[PDB]
Design a protein around this ligand. Structure first.
Ligand SMILES: *C(=O)c1ccccc1
Ligand SMILES: *C(=O)c1ccccc1
Ligand SMILES: *C(=O)c1ccccc1
Lengths: 114, 114, 113
């Protein structure tokens, strides 16, 4: 799995330990070993949400399975929770796109997961 | 709906009001209220299009519906038009990937749109 | 086709000539290089398996030319380039492949449909 957050929150407002926290919480949530979890935070972005430049985030979570109705609500509560606590972003200013990838469409270590 | 543009155009060449113009024009084009629209511009990128580093843009539009043949042609004319006028990017050096997201696969405000 | 690589490798470690990717993608996909778009994003705040050693998160979008065997080939190619040029271990690279419908790719005021 792999989680990306793009935000207008400045770099200095991202707490040390954030990428580790996301890695551990995502490992717990998805039931996958942390060794497979990739996380990426992109601060200082030029963005707007509803026409406002108040803190916001545009995120993605890609997984091979483990994507679906109830699971995605649970991930949203988790990830919005983290972004609110750690980056002070309102949950109503967060979008998270969820992608259920086919194993043949994820490359890794010179091959794919197929 | 949500629109992202990555470009090699420098930040100083992004005019004031650009995010807001995107927001307003996307609201007009998609019909959706502006308060839902997210926009994101990433200048100063290291990119090439057809092997050349002349101004170019790689973009995405995600929407829950309101994606299809004619709609996407209309969006492309709109967006290419804005990029040409405001960032001086030739339309033939713009790619826009369109994504029709399932509501269950879009997180927002501690829950999804399903 | 379009290829995007996001990496914590610093900008100074991306060698001259790298945006090589265009040529090699043209060759791999059997498409003219005029169609190929490439984007490299260095200096990123990222981890892979909880480590901040060099890593990359990438995407390849194509209108067709995506599938089992093809994607393995693309991955050997691309991981090879990332290892040689950016000193990223192949097991610290993910590449998401997307088979786009022509109607869902915009270009030159219209789409490819
Ligand atoms: C996680 O293992 C994963 C899933 C999809 C893309 C990348 C990583
Ligand atoms: C807009 O409401 C929207 C649609 C799809 C993904 C993100 C935002
Ligand atoms: C290649 O021509 C291509 C570029 C953008 C999206 C899909 C394919």
């Amino acid at each position: 799995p792999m989680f990306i957050v793009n935000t207008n929150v400045p770099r200095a407002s991202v707490p040390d330990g954030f990428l580790s926290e996301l890695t551990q919480q995502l490992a717990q949530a998805t039931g996958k070993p942390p060794q497979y979890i990739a996380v990426h935070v992109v601060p200082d972005q030029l963005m707007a949400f509803g026409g406002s430049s108040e803190p916001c985030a545009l995120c993605s979570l890609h997984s091979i399975g483990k994507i679906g109705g109830a699971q995605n609500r649970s991930y949203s509560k988790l990830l919005c929770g983290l972004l609110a606590e750690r980056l002070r972003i309102s949950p109503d200013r967060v979008y998270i796109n969820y992608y259920d990838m086919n194993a043949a469409n994820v490359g890794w270590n010179n091959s794919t997961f197929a």
